Design a protein around this nucleic acid. Structure first.
Ligand SMILES: [Mg+2]
Ligand SMILES: [Mg+2]
Ligand SMILES: [Mg+2]
Ligand SMILES: [Mg+2]
Ligand SMILES: [Mg+2]
Ligand SMILES: [Mg+2]
Ligand SMILES: [Mg+2]
Ligand SMILES: [Mg+2]
Ligand SMILES: [Mg+2]
Ligand SMILES: [Mg+2]
Ligand SMILES: [Mg+2]
Ligand SMILES: [Mg+2]
Ligand SMILES: [Mg+2]
Ligand SMILES: [Mg+2]
Ligand SMILES: [Mg+2]
Ligand SMILES: [Mg+2]
Ligand SMILES: [Mg+2]
Ligand SMILES: [Mg+2]
Ligand SMILES: [Mg+2]
Ligand SMILES: [Mg+2]
Ligand SMILES: [Mg+2]
Lengths: 156, 212, 225
RNA sequence: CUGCAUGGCUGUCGUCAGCUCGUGUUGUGAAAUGUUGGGUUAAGUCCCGCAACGAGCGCAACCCUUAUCCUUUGUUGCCAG
RNA sequence: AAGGCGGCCCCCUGGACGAAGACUGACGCUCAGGUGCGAAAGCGUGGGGAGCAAACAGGAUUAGAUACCCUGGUAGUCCACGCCGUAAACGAUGUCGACUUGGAGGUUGUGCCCUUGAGGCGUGGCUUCCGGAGCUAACGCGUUAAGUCGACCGCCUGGGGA
RNA sequence: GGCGUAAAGCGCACGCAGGCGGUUUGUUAAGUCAGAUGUGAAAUCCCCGGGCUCAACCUGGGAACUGCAUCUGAUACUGG
């Protein structure tokens, strides 16, 4: 059902009185592949435990996105602490035009055609949050018509 | 040195001895020399067989070695011929006639010597130490052991500098003297030196001391 | 029961001074009297009736409710109301991670049977008094906090907070899970994380008893089949 | 010969009292709470308070000797009559 | 306005705020060049010089001490007219407009209430602390925003070399 | 894109040229908006077809050449 995927693994350190003790961090993106997406950032003493730690949190912290049939509704921009993302709906056959930690999360989410661009610091940890906020803040024609008070054909 | 051997700290409380007899030191030295010889001969012979432990009793003008093993069939043989074959050598090494007993050990993955064994074989056949130790500890926890602690040290994975890794599950009260802390050692002779393995298996709290 | 007149003589007027009022409480507060904000019953009552209706709507069907009123004076009233209405409650310090950390508090809940065997059976008969005293002391300490939720088993369905500013910890754990909360707030509280807001006094001895009686009556009337 | 490849064993901090983990929470994140604060102690011993809830290695106890009394059995050990 | 300003009195004068009243009718904001002011230190002229104190003399610690410490001590610090225009000239935050939850104050007006106490209810000007939303890499800002804008000027584009 | 702390608010104030500018009406229509004409060479790019056995290559038509000048109107905004 889900399309869980690990993005990248990082090795952190922490000095103590006896010395330095290492640790591992894992970032994962999960989703049903149709309209849902979620991210998980876990940390553990070892790579195999950290990936599962990230996966569980990603599974239980998913976000539903009101996407189009194969793309996203309208072009959007998301702003985070250090990463800015711009996503534009492309046509059929283009593919997931993205890079870094954006193409994986976009393919897991369900979209198949989108032009994505990253501005600022292109770190995965911030860019994942930026690209999920960009999909969370956008709305559908039905959703905007609901608050407008008119019909989709009227607000075409 | 940090830790004392957990067997000979509770041998007088909860743990049994591996050699039960008496001497007035007129023959004590030769008795242990004989015990050492028979133990090393048995260890060298029953290599494929997973021998759990070797207890020795020495009554008057006779001996009785009660080997405990996980797979007794290999030592037994068809129609009990192999035991008769390997009994005469023990009898003539010890002088007095022998009577070898064999005891099957239930739950072969819950014995300290057995779990310390075959991990050296995995290292010899180049099985990763981390996954080997993880499988051993998880199998021991699943079988019913309340606590397992496995340490592996020395030239792990054929690196350049030796280290010491360890895993632990449940609880291993090494300081208490009212629990089964069955512990044994083993070594692996790899292509780049020797690797030491230690295993502690806490099963339960034996109330009342010795004799149940 | 829910009449406007009874609350006036019970005392709901004085909630807190005008220096502690929360800025986003303007609509519920009618005015200021003696530098003390006074709540208005004309809007206190209809929202309380709506909350009671929605709560008995869940009470009629299956669902467990919590009664978080962990005050220094309302503890006995909360316990009595919960015992009368045959529901669960907590009458001591709210253990952080009681709902979001159920995976670990279930062990504590399940450990006042095999650990209370020292008191109900003694093992043999109060075995090893020297450690039996420690065993019974820890047993008492363990259920002192969670004695009212020992029969739950599963996660609750609805929440009732008496002090929605003093017990924001419970509200924080309820919000990320997604269970309705019919909380009563004061003039110094935040109606942001709570799902149903009941403005009015909560630290008065008589007002809390009146609210507990009303909620017990509605929950035992919704489920009376 | 290489303890600057090691296994095993051992000394030191120190018989100091700290060292960590699971879940939860907080901060994007290194990380923090838990382990701090108040009494208390030989002590992370206990209590209270507190986004903490529990557990493991640990601090103690169980183990050995001795300090009183009772009982079982008196030779090679003792002499109330 | 900034620099900055502390006994008292007199003389001349700039600036700010409030109660009520009428007109002038966009006359309004910013500003490259330009001008003016501009801490202290510094220089020229003519004086003054109690204390303090660069330079300098002696003593002392230190292996050495051209310093920190001690005893003296010149310029300077002071006055008037002149010259430079430098500072962590700091709120490291350029001027103005309006919008966007609160609490505790400080100073200074003003309306009304029995002013029995620095009694209360409103409204203005300046300023301090805490803090919500929001912003920021974080610290932190937070109605005197570092929150969302509008008008203008200046500056930044790797560290040294500079 | 930024100027509190990484580089970035002149030390401050006045002010010329310049930049912008509260609110209503009428007028002009300069910018702006609509339509038309001429021109914006051929060549080149793109789209639809053809010829070289395919392609490179050549070629027909269309579109485009984002611009300028003139004429005829629109008056909300900026401008007089
Ligand atoms: Mg004056
Ligand atoms: Mg200038
Ligand atoms: Mg001077
Ligand atoms: Mg002097
Ligand atoms: Mg001097
Ligand atoms: Mg001079
Ligand atoms: Mg300068
Ligand atoms: Mg400056
Ligand atoms: Mg100016
Ligand atoms: Mg001022
Ligand atoms: Mg603040
Ligand atoms: Mg930049
Ligand atoms: Mg700077
Ligand atoms: Mg700097
Ligand atoms: Mg400045
Ligand atoms: Mg200047
Ligand atoms: Mg025109
Ligand atoms: Mg035109
Ligand atoms: Mg062709
Ligand atoms: Mg052309
Ligand atoms: Mg005009």
């Amino acid at each position: 059902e889900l399309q869980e995927k690990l993005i990248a693994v990082n090795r952190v350190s922490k000095t103590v009185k006896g010395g330095r003790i290492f640790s591992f961090t894992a970032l994962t993106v999960v989703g049903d592949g149709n309209g849902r997406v979620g991210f998980g950032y876990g940390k553990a003493r070892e790579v195999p435990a950290a990936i599962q730690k990230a996966m569980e949190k990603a599974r239980r912290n998913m976000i539903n996105v009101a996407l189009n049939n194969g793309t996203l509704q309208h072009p959007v921009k998301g702003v985070h602490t250090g990463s800015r993302v711009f996503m534009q709906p492309a046509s059929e056959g283009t593919g997931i035009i993205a890079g870094g930690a954006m193409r994986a999360v976009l393919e897991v989410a369900g979209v198949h055609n989108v032009l994505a661009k990253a501005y600022g610091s292109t770190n995965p940890i911030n860019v994942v949050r930026a690209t999920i906020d960009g999909l969370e803040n956008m709305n559908s024609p039905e959703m905007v018509a609901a608050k407008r008070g008119k019909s989709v054909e009227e607000i075409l | 040195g940090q830790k004392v051997h957990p067997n000979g700290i509770r041998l007088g409380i909860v743990k049994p001895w591996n050699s039960t007899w008496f001497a007035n030191t007129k023959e004590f030295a030769d008795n242990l020399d004989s015990d050492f010889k028979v133990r090393q001969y048995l260890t060298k012979e029953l290599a494929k067989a997973s021998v759990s432990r070797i207890v020795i009793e020495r009554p008057a003008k006779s001996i009785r070695v009660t080997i405990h093993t996980a797979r007794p069939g290999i030592v037994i043989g068809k129609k009990g011929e192999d035991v008769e074959k390997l009994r005469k050598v023990v009898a003539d090494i010890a002088g007095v006639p022998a009577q070898i007993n064999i005891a099957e050990v239930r739950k072969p993955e819950l014995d300290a010597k057995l779990v310390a064994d075959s991990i050296t074989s995995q290292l010899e056949r180049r099985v990763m130490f981390r996954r080997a130790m993880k499988r051993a500890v998880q199998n021991a926890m699943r079988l019913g052991a309340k606590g397992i602690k496995v340490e592996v040290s020395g030239r792990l994975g054929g690196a350049e500098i030796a280290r010491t890794e360890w895993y632990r599950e449940g609880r291993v009260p090494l300081h208490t003297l009212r629990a089964d802390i069955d512990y044994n050692t083993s070594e692996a002779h790899t292509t780049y030196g020797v690797i030491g393995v230690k295993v502690w298996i806490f099963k339960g709290e034996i109330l009342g001391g010795m004799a149940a | 029961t829910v009449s406007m007149r009874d609350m006036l003589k019970a005392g709901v007027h004085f909630g807190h001074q005008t220096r502690y009022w929360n800025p986003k409480m303007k609509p519920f507060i009618f005015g200021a009297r003696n530098k003390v904000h006074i709540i208005n019953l004309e809007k206190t009552v209809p929202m309380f009736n709506e909350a009671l209706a929605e709560l008995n709507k869940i009470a009629s069907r299956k669902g467990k409710i919590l009664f978080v009123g962990t005050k220094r004076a309302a503890s006995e009233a909360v316990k009595d109301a919960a015992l009368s209405c045959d529901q669960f409650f907590v009458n001591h310090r709210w253990l952080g991670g009681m709902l979001t950390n159920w995976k670990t508090v279930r062990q504590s809940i399940k450990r006042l049977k095999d650990l209370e065997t020292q008191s109900q059976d003694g093992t043999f008969d109060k075995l090893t008094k020297k450690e039996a005293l420690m065993r019974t002391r820890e047993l008492e300490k363990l259920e002192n906090s969670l004695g009212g939720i020992k029969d739950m088993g599963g996660l609750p369905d609805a929440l009732f907070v008496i002090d929605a500013d003093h017990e924001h910890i419970a509200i924080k754990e309820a919000n990320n899970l997604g269970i309705p909360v019919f909380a009563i707030v004061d003039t110094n509280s935040d109606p942001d994380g709570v799902d149903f807001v009941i403005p009015g006094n909560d630290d008065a001895i008589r007002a809390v008893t009146l609210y507990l009686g009303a909620v017990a009556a509605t929950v035992r009337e919704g489920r009376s089949q």
